[PDB]
């Protein structure tokens, strides 16, 4: 009873899961806060795997002990750039690597 796998563009981590509810998004941002990672919102007109850089929304949220504060920035960013992909990333400054990364908004249509 085998299906042939559909071709579908993906967006790295969590993009094979059914889309994150806002509660699931907040659970991931809570994890960041607890892990001590700094949230950063980035947006891009495209999702090309080759490109290294998306555009930074404001600055990283360095002083953040509040998932809603992150969620507010995502809402605000999505308002200004609903035509764009928006992605939440966590940054570990001790190992200096981005530890978390998932798309929270794909562009309209």
């Amino acid at each position: 009873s085998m299906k042939t796998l559909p071709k579908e563009r993906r967006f790295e981590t969590f993009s094979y899961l059914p889309p994150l509810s806002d509660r699931q998004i907040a659970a991931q941002i809570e994890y960041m806060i607890e892990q001590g990672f700094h949230p950063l919102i980035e947006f891009n007109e495209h999702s090309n795997p080759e490109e290294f850089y998306w555009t930074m929304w404001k600055l990283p949220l360095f002083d953040c002990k509040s998932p809603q504060q992150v969620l507010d920035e995502v809402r605000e960013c999505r308002s200004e750039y609903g035509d764009c992909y928006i992605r939440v990333a966590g940054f570990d400054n001790i190992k200096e690597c981005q530890t978390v990364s998932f798309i929270v908004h794909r562009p309209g249509r």
Partner: protein
Amino acid sequence: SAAGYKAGVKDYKLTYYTPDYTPKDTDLLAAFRFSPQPGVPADEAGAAIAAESSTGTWTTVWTDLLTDMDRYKGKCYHIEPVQGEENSYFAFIAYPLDLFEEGSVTNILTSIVGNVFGFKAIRSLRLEDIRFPVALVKTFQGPPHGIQVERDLLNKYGRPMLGCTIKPKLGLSAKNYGRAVYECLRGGLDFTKDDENINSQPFQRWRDRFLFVADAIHKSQAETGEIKGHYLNVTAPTCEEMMKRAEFAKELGMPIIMHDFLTAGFTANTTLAKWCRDNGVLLHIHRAMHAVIDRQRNHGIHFRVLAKCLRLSGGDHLHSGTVVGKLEGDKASTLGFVDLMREDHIEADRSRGVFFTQDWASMPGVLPVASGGIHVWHMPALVEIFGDDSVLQFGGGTLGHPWGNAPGATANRVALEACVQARNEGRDLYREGGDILREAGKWSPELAAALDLWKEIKFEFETMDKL
């Protein structure tokens, strides 16, 4: 001063056993587990090891007195008997920094493990650990890239990476090889890979494989929107032939290649690691033949030494075992050498098999690769054991899916992401792993088919390599 040549055989323990010695921070320290032959005392056995692995031979030579032997000789500075083992001891031996060629793992091995293992006066010998002093660590390049730079290069964050070894090991043509590669990668795996004994053979010559695989990477990447890679095996008969292969991989813009560091050797591997650094190609290190050396706990070299030697010689990935899979891996000591291959500072901890505190002076970590006899049911354990900074590899666990490669790849990628989400949310992968998997199988039919297929398959045997 050096005064008085007296010809003839003395006891090694006269010159080389120095229980009052306190190791300098520039000393290379080795821990040996040994059993002396009957009537050979432990301290004379330890001193024989220190002697023949540094400066000494079997009689007195006058040439010693031309130099300053106190500053060059190895010093068996401590012996302790193994708790509960009869006639088994640890010798701890210090070696001066001066004894070693800078940046040469080949030379370090030739000294420490060159001859002493075949001493008639010794029944069995096993090197457990080496404390590489920071002054020596800094003469090596290390990983071409290492964990952080690799994730940045590939845009891969927030999870273990997923690979797949193409099967059968041997037999497929270059075209069918790339076929299997395209279907795996399009399904959601980050990497595919040559099996370690795919080099260049009558049924499939290497340049043909590189060419068809490059095409499969471009296609599957264009389709999925994620960076894809395939560890092309450049392991070869000669340096020249190895470079040739590495060069064509670069020409094709392949992000990652593969090398068998033990069967090819540390001299060739160090050449390749340097090349990779200069050419921005990632280096996956396969550990073929390691178990010939590291399996039995009475004789050989423990893998955690080989892992430290490779971090020095250079590799971006290294196979670390699965613990839970078809090949042997003790969990305690595996957590030990994964720390040794990843972290910058690892405290001594004998419960993890870590005999010496190791510092890496900011030398990049090596991604551990869990590969061998693992499938979807193992996923929560693999994530719990290794964490994000790992590559989990499913050969039969992808190509043996009922519906083929792409469904097989989706099953694993879904299983993985589910486990990572559950973990981030605070679920216990240990307790809730099968439930997290069954939940995900509710909405992923290809995952469900894999869970069904491999429900009964466990590998549970007595581990020979007990701490």
